[PDB]
Amino acid sequence: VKQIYKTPPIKDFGGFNFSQILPDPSKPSKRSFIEDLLFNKVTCAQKFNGLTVLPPLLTDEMIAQYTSALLAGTITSGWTFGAGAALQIPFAMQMAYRFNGIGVTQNVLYENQKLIANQFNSAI
């Protein structure tokens, strides 16, 4: 992102639940249950003459909504947010769009969706 993107305030989910990526407020950073779990399992007297371990540029607290900034990217355009303008673009035909190259078609999703959104929530 060339523009500091974003994260939704409305949980209009109704068949999905976009709330494990888009964070719960339970933790002080923007790192909820899923991001409480991919960091917290990544498991001095040394420094008596100078030898530390350097920290890189982006430590733990820009990317827990910069990855929302890409979550405000890669579903909000699909790809095209990145080098220019972007506004809203939805998902459950993006749950068919990139599937319009996989060999299979658009309304493999749309119709048995109220099973398949549950199965894609079984993919949650």
């Binding site: 355009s77 790809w79 095209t80 990145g82 080098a83 220019g84 303008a85 972007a86 506004l87 809203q88 673009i89 939805p90 035909m93 068919a96 769009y97 990139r98 319009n100 190259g101 078609t105 658009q106 309304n107 749309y110 119709e111 048995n112 969706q113 109220k114």
Partner: protein, 117 residues
């Protein structure tokens, strides 16, 4: 040898966006790559059908996506918006509708209907 030669498929490996082409330039102790990417800007919403269970009989796109403004139905492709009329030449077959519940009802165009007359 994968951005300048050839047209790759690898995003964040040939610049930023869908890689189109590549212009290399020399540099003091360096190599500089220009990149051309197809990154569109302006969009909308659109509204779909599930399908067209036309003769009691469903319909699939070939390579793209059915949409509508809300009344007129349009077949189009994935990345650029050229709405077209849903023909039989944009559909194939594979077997019965309503073991897949959740379709809507519509028509498909079929260009023979003026031809013999």
């Amino acid at each position: 040898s994968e951005c300048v030669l050839g047209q790759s498929k690898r995003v964040d490996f040939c610049g930023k966006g869908y890689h189109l082409m590549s212009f290399p330039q020399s540099a003091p102790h360096g190599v500089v790559f220009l990149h051309v990417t197809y990154v569109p800007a302006q969009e909308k919403n659109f509204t779909t059908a599930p399908a067209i269970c036309h003769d009691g009989k469903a319909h699939f796109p070939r390579e793209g996506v059915f949409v509508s403004n809300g009344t007129h139905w349009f077949v189009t492709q994935r990345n650029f918006y050229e709405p077209q009329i849903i023909t039989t030449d944009n559909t194939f077959v594979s077997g019965n509708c309503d073991v897949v519940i959740g379709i809507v009802n519509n028509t498909v165009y079929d260009p023979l209907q003026p031809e013999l007359d």
